[PDB]
Structures are given as C-alpha cells and as structure tokens.
Amino acid sequence: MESADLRALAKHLYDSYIKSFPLTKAKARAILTGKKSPFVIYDMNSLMMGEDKIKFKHITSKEVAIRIFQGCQFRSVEAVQEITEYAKSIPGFVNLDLNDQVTLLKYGVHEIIYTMLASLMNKDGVLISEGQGFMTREFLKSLRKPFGDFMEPKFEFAVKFNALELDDSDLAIFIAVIILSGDRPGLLNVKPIEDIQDNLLQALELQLKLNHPESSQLFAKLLQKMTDLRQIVTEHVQLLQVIKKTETLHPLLQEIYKDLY
Amino acid sequence: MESADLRALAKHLYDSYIKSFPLTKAKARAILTGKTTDKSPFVIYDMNSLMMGEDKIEVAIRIFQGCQFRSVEAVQEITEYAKSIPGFVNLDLNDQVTLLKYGVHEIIYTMLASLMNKDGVLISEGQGFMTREFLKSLRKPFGDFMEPKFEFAVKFNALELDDSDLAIFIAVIILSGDRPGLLNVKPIEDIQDNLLQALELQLKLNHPESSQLFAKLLQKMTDLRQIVTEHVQLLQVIKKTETDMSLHPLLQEIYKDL
Numbered sequence: 001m002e003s004a005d006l007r008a009l010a011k012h013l014y015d016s017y018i019k020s021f022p023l024t025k026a027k028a029r030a031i032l033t034g035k036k037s038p039f040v041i042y043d044m045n046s047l048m049m050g051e052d053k054i055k056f057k058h059i060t061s062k063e064v065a066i067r068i069f070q071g072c073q074f075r076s077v078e079a080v081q082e083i084t085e086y087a088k089s090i091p092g093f094v095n096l097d098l099n100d101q102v103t104l105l106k107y108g109v110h111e112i113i114y115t116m117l118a119s120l121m122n123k124d125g126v127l128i129s130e131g132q133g134f135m136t137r138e139f140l141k142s143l144r145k146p147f148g149d150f151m152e153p154k155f156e157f158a159v160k161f162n163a164l165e166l167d168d169s170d171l172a173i174f175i176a177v178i179i180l181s182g183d184r185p186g187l188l189n190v191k192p193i194e195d196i197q198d199n200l201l202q203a204l205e206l207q208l209k210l211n212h213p214e215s216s217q218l219f220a221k222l223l224q225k226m227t228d229l230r231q232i233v234t235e236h237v238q239l240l241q242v243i244k245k246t247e248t249l250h251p252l253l254q255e256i257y258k259d260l261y
Numbered sequence: 262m263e264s265a266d267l268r269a270l271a272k273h274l275y276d277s278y279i280k281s282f283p284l285t286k287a288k289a290r291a292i293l294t295g296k297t298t299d300k301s302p303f304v305i306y307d308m309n310s311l312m313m314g315e316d317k318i319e320v321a322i323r324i325f326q327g328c329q330f331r332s333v334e335a336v337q338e339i340t341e342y343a344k345s346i347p348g349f350v351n352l353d354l355n356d357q358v359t360l361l362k363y364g365v366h367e368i369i370y371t372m373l374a375s376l377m378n379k380d381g382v383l384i385s386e387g388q389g390f391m392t393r394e395f396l397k398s399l400r401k402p403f404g405d406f407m408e409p410k411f412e413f414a415v416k417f418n419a420l421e422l423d424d425s426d427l428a429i430f431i432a433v434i435i436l437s438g439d440r441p442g443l444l445n446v447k448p449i450e451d452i453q454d455n456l457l458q459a460l461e462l463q464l465k466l467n468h469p470e471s472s473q474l475f476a477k478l479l480q481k482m483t484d485l486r487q488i489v490t491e492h493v494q495l496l497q498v499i500k501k502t503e504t505d506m507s508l509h510p511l512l513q514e515i516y517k518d519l
C-alpha cells in the first residue's frame with residue numbers, strides 16, 4: 001500500500017534530475033563509448049587549443065596546473081547551484097527549517113559532486129563542457145606538484161563507483177538520500193529529515209530491485225559506497241588545505257570559492 | 262537465497278557469537294539496569310575508588326593499559342568468531358589476515374557500545390563499572406582519547422540491536438571486499454552478499470516496526486570507518502609522547518600500515 005507511492009517518488013525525482021543537471025549519465029556514456037565527437041585534451045598544446053575551441057568560461061596565474069584546478073573549482077560552483085535546485089524538488093525538503101536546509105546542502109554537496117562526477121568519467125578521462133570536451137586521465141595525473149595527486153583519486157573512486165552500473169533513475173534517488181542525512185553537524189530538527197530519508201531509502205530499494213533484479217544486494221552495496229564518499233571528501237579537504245599553504249586571486253573570487261577551498 | 266537457509270545462517274552466527282565472546286549485550290544490559298543484588302558492579306568514579314576497586318575485583322597509563330589488554334583479548338575473540346563464518350577459513354590466507362587486520366577495530370568499537378551507557382562502561386567481565394566523567398577527565402591526551410568511544414556508543418545503542426543482530430552485523434564488517442590489498446575480492450563479496458541477506462531478514466523479523474533499520478545499520482559502518490581513522494591517528498600521536506606506553510605485538514602489527 002506504498003509501492004505506487006514509491007514509484008511515484010522515483011519518477012518525480014528522475015524528472016527533476018533531468019531538468020536540473022546539464023549532462024545525464026546516459027548521454028555521457030554515449031559520448032565516452034563513441035556510440036558529435038568531443039575535443040580531446042591530452043597535453044599542454046591541446047589544452048591551449050581547447051580553450052579557444054570549447055569556449056571555457058573560467059579563463060581570465062598562467063601556470064597550467066593552476067588553471068586546470070581553477071576550472072574544476074568553477075565547475076564545482078555551478079554544480080552546487082544545480083544540486084541546490086534539485087534539492088528543492090525533493091518532497092518535504094523546502095518545508096524543513098531554513099537553517100537545516102542550508103546545513104544539509106553545505107555538508108552534502110561535496111559527496112554529491114564526487115558521485116555525479118563519476119557519471120562523466122571512465123578509466124581514461126573525463127567529460128567537460130557538457131560533453132564537448134574530454135580531458136585524459138594521464139594528462140590530469142601528470143600535472144606537477146600536488147595537483148597531479150589531487151586529480152587521480154577522483155578517477156580511482158569513479159572507476160569503482162561506475163562498476164555498480166547505476167543509471168540516472170537510480171542516481172536521482174541516491175543523491176536525494178545523501179542530501180537528507182540526519183547526522184549532519186548542527187541540525188536543529190533531525191526527525192523530519194530522517195522521516196524523508198526513510199521514504200527515499202524505501203524508494204531506492206524498490207528502484208534497484210526493479211531496475212537491477214539480477215544484481216543481488218545492490219542496495220546494500222550502494223549504501224557501502226557512502227563510506228568511500230565520506231572518506232574521500234575528508235581526504236579532499238586535507239589536500240585543499242595543503243594546496244592553500246603552498247601555492248602563492250581577487251578577494252571577490254576568493255569569496256565566491258570560499259565554500260570549496 | 263532461501264529464507265530457511267538465511268535463518269539457519271543467523272542461528273549459526275548467533276550461536277557462535279555466544280561461544281566466542283565472554284560478555285553479551287543481554288548480560289551487560291542486565292548489569293547496567295540493575296534491579297538485581299547478585300550482579301551489581303563496583304563503580305569507579307575517582308582515584309580513591311580505583312584504589313579500592315583493585316582490591317575488590319601513573320593512573321592514565323594504567324587505565325590505558327587496562328583498555329589495551331581488553332582490546333587484545335577482543336582481537337583474539339573476534340579472530341575465533343571469524344573462523345566460524347562459513348567460507349571465511351576457505352579464503353586465501355593473505356586475505357584472511359587482511360580482513361581481520363582492517364576489520365577488528367570496527368568490531369571492537371561496535372561491541373564496546375554493548376558494554377556502555379551514557380554514564381560509563383562495564384569492565385572486568387561486568388564486575389566493575391568505570392564512569393565516563395572519570396575517563397574523560399584523565400590528563401593530557403588520554404581524556405580526549407576515551408570520550409569518542411562513548412560518543413559513538415550513545416548513537417549506536419539508540420538502534421537497540423540485540424546480540425542476535427550484532428552477530429550478523431559483525432560478520433558483514435569482517436567480509437568487506439573493499440579492504441586494501443585483497444587478492445580475491447569476488448569470493449569475499451559472495452559471502453558478504455549472503456550475510457547481508459541474512460542481516461536484512463533478521464532485522465525485518467526481529468524489529469518489524471523499525472523502518473529501514475537495515476539501511477540505518479549500514480550507515481553506521483560509515484561512522485565506524487571514520488572513528489577508527491581518528492583513533493589510529495590519536496594513538497600514533499600518543500606514542501610520540503609516551504615511552505611508558507607499549508602495545509601488545511598483535512595490536513602493534515595491526516597498526517603497521519593502518
């Protein structure tokens with residue numbers, strides 16, 4: 001006497017996920033498998049050609065590794081706003097205390113950006129600019145100093161996450177579960193947050209059983225990935241703090257990126 | 262993939278848990294909630310009571326070594342329990358070691374919660390109770406080393422698991438295919454899938470009113486991973502101050518490359 005409601009919730013989230021995000025996993029997989037050919041960035045010279053060709057919006061430090069890093073930051077700021085908009089479509093979310101809405105987004109966005117970045121990645125590289133560009137793993141990993149080692153962990157996660165072979169309809173519910181985490185620091189009213197999460201968890205369970213009937217305990221396996229997510233976001237923050245203390249932007253830019261650096 | 266067999270696995274693990282671990286949650290809760298004359302613990306809440314306690318059943322170090330001794334015994338008990346998990350002893354021996362190496366700390370924390378309430382922890386097989394305020398007020402780094410165990414336990418215990426639930430939960434933790442340096446992930450995940458199926462049915466039957474308890478329990482495996490990380494880091498920092506500190510080889514070996 002709830003199954004229909006769970007399927008309704010799944011479809012509602014799917015529909016909103018398609019509206020909120022620029023490039024779906026389905027579209028990104030078509031591009032990556034070669035099934036409208038993207039510009040490939042595999043080295044310095046092709047980077048320089050790519051910024052002319054694929055019309056990047058973050059280019060104004062002239063050093064390459066920094067300009068790539070900054071472009072990741074620029075795209076992360078856009079994703080935060082797309083996730084924020086997506087969250088508003090989650091049933092019950094806008095009815096929560098306003099401070100709790102801000103807390104949930106603040107502590108959730110990093111985990112969601114990682115998850116969704118996996119949709120744009122394979123073992124060889126990552127889609128950029130809505131699938132119009134493709135930057136190689138080897139190029140990113142081979143950037144100097146801390147920057148190479150900052151990039152590679154994202155791929156290491158993606159490769160593992162992608163082995164679950166989730167589609168967009170699965171991810172739309174998963175992302176919602178992450179946002180509605182009752183254990184975030186400083187939440188004023190945990191009860192309604194866990195009540196919503198319980199519904200989303202039910203919807204994700206049924207979704208995964210219907211969409212992947214042959215993949216046993218996929219639900220559990222997906223929940224275990226929340227462990228990898230928490231871990232890598234912690235590492236992330238630590239790597240950023242090291243970048244800050246070593247690398248020597250306009251105060252307004254600093255202010256725009258304060259959340260992500 | 263057949264309930265009868267999932268229930269059979271749950272009974273097997275429960276029975277083995279009872280054999281391997283001295284002090285169950287059921288017994289600990291009976292001691293903590295009291296109402297009984299026969300099982301009443303001596304309570305240690307300060308230095309004098311500690312002194313009387315040692316007659317009846319540096320201070321921060323002696324307490325630390327008390328915790329350490331019990332952790333070593335726990336590793337031994339967990340190791341014995343692991344062998345009873347169907348399929349575990351059949352795995353590559355290196356993987357066996359790796360699963361125990363990365364699994365034992367998460368299990369110690371989980372099972373320590375059974376011995377705790379918000380005000381303290383059972384010790385000496387339930388014959389003692391040492392207060393949280395005493396432990397937290399130990400000097401230097403030691404106070405802050407003790408307190409996070411209680412902070413976890415309070416949250417974990419809110420789930421109200423019983424021993425029959427924990428037996429399966431602990432098995433799930435051990436059979437984690439994502440541990441670093443595992444040679445053969447597949448047969449580990451095959452066992453885990455069975456344990457997960459057994460856990461899900463156990464929780465549905467034993468807690469039918471508790472919605473998505475399965476999912477909430479798996480989300481606690483996230484807390485565990487993080488708390489073990491912090492534990493290891495703080496223990497490493499305590500080593501670089503304390504020479505009067507020494508770790509049993511079993512623990513020392515687990516911490517190398519943890």
Ligand SMILES: [O]C(=O)C1=[C][C]=C(C2=NN(C(=O)C3=C(Cl)[C]=[C][C]=C3C(F)(F)F)C3=C2[C]=C(Cl)[C]=[C]3)C(O[C]C2=[C][C]=C3O=[C]OC3=[C]2)=[C]1
Nearest residue numbers: 068071072073075076079110113114117126128151154260
């Ligand atoms: O959904 C998308 O389209 C999306 C989402 C995330 C990234 C991306 N973010 N990021 C972070 O570190 C990061 C991450 Cl996970 C999480 C939070 C904050 C940050 C941060 F710190 F930035 F604020 C990365 C990222 C990608 C890589 Cl490969 C490595 C690190 C992204 O990146 C596209 C991209 C690649 C090379 C370029 O080179 C120039 O512009 C580029 C844009 C896309």
Ligand SMILES: [O]C(=O)C1=[C][C]=C(C2=NN(C(=O)C3=C(Cl)[C]=[C][C]=C3C(F)(F)F)C3=C2[C]=C(Cl)[C]=[C]3)C(O[C]C2=[C][C]=C3O=[C]OC3=[C]2)=[C]1
Nearest residue numbers: 324327328329331332335369370372373382384391407410
């Ligand atoms: O199953 C049990 O019976 C059990 C299991 C774990 C502990 C315990 N360990 N520990 C550690 O740090 C610790 C932990 Cl989690 C894991 C690995 C290594 C260590 C270590 F670092 F030791 F090597 C603690 C522990 C307890 C607290 Cl409250 C705080 C830290 C335990 O402790 C009972 C105890 C309390 C006060 C006393 O005071 C004298 O003896 C005592 C025994 C029991």
